[PDB]
Design a protein around this ligand. Sequence first.
Ligand SMILES: OC[C@H]1O[C@@](CO)(O[C@H]2O[C@H](CO)[C@@H](O)[C@H](O)[C@H]2O)[C@@H](O)[C@@H]1O
Ligand SMILES: [Mg+2]
Length: 580
Amino acid sequence: AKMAFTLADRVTEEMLADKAALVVEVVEENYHDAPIVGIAVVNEHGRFFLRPETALADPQFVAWLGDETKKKSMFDSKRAAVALKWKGIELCGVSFDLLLAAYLLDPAQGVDDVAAAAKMKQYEAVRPDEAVYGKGAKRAVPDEPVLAEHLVRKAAAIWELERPFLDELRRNEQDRLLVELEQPLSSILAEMEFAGVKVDTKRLEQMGKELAEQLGTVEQRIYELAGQEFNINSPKQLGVILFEKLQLPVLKKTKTGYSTSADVLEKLAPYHEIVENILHYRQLGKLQSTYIEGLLKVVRPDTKKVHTIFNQALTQTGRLSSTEPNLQNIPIRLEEGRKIRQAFVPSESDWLIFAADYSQIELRVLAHIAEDDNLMEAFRRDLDIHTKTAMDIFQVSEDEVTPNMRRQAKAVNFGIVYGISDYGLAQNLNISRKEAAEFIERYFESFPGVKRYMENIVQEAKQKGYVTTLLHRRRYLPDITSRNFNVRSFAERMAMNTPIQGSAADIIKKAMIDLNARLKEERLQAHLLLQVHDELILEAPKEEMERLCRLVPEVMEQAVTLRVPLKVDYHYGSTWYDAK
DNA sequence: GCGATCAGG
DNA sequence: GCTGATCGCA
Ligand SMILES: OC[C@H]1O[C@@](CO)(O[C@H]2O[C@H](CO)[C@@H](O)[C@H](O)[C@H]2O)[C@@H](O)[C@@H]1O
Ligand SMILES: [Mg+2]
């Protein structure tokens, strides 16, 4: 059953054909400055395995890799491209990425390796990576014979699977989504990750010192009020102190014990002074452990930069995710946590951070897809959407909208943007499910077009089995037919929400591609560093700010043309914190 | 390893 | 509502 192939000791001309399935294996999960353990090539002439030290030192092979006219089919090309960038080698001509193809066909399958993608087309002549490399403290690279056969089988699977995957994408009207959006985006993300973001470690360390002192003060105060010392970080130990020793009311319980989440503590604060201190401790501890110590752990000592990895094939909405570190959830709401952003600085002297964000892109997308007259008019007038929503649902003039009314209208809009249930809204506003439902009812009366859309999209999901986005991304919802109210309800809200969130994801991805093309045409040194769902973060020479102030918003606003305009806000400064 | 927690959009 | 990082405890 063994698969034939040549275990080459040298690179030959037949290995450099203009079309091939290529495997440049990086076993380490985090591929930054990571080892390439082997290379496999499959083309019209045969199957070949090459030792990295050999292939990567060969001028012809390196030239072949960087030749845009020599087309390669791969799985997770970004991983290979980045690992190669760290070695000063350019990878060009990737015309098909099986990971991205599988992801577009069905994001819910969780395809994470060639074997998983192959199984989608009943191809099983390849082993899962985990079976070959193991996992955890057991994860390691097998002897050459085992490694070589695995890489060749993966290349062979890619070679065989390109056509059927492209055929199905074509049927789904997703061929352009792969070739014109996701694949070009993959290269841009590779550049962003490789560039990394500079961190002011001295500043971070100084902050940690301060928090350490503040944590010590609050920590001691907590034992003072509790009358004893315990592990505040232990929900179990803390639960004992709060609900047994101090006799605080049990307003909520968890699957295993007493609930001590912030929302619960907030309600208990009036009963005892220890509560506010626990909350403060929680806040400081979160910053210290996750955003100070955690960040410092992944900063590269030599360059002082962090190189995140964007997972482009994970979410069912089309959004990106960020890891090691996660740069999509750096604090900003509270001033104390916001200061963390002062640690993210430009990578060069006299450069600045530039940040541009879409203003309410999700609700604008909803106005467009639902063709709701009221919502479209609101955005055409560039109204404060929360104030407008409050005016409509509570039936009052703009002057009559109170701060509490706007806050609740804003919560309703938040619920619409993320597709939360009436139960979730009730929880967020600390009201009854019935009152939350009444708010939603009033909203649909004010925005009948949105109501019709939500009804129609649910019916469409049930009829076709999936829902789609502006650029044809797809999400299957098998649970839409469940006879279980909760399971079905969740699916219906995803049917409602995915076209909204997913289309917003499509738009910013296209904006990134359009922006990089524009930056190159204008020969600006400015470059993308991060994407945080509805915002783009760049760095550039201070002398390019004025040009970026006009260029970036324009490109982002013109990425697509909707029934309502798109609006982009922007700021720049010496640190990410200052780009506000 | 996994629940409980909390950060962002 | 989701994804990722932390912690404590299995
Ligand atoms: O290279 C990213 C790419 O690989 C997958 C597996 O095919 O994820 C792996 O690498 C990520 C970055 O280190 C990890 O977060 C993840 O746990 C690991 O399996 C894909 O999901 C991703 O698109
Ligand atoms: Mg915004």
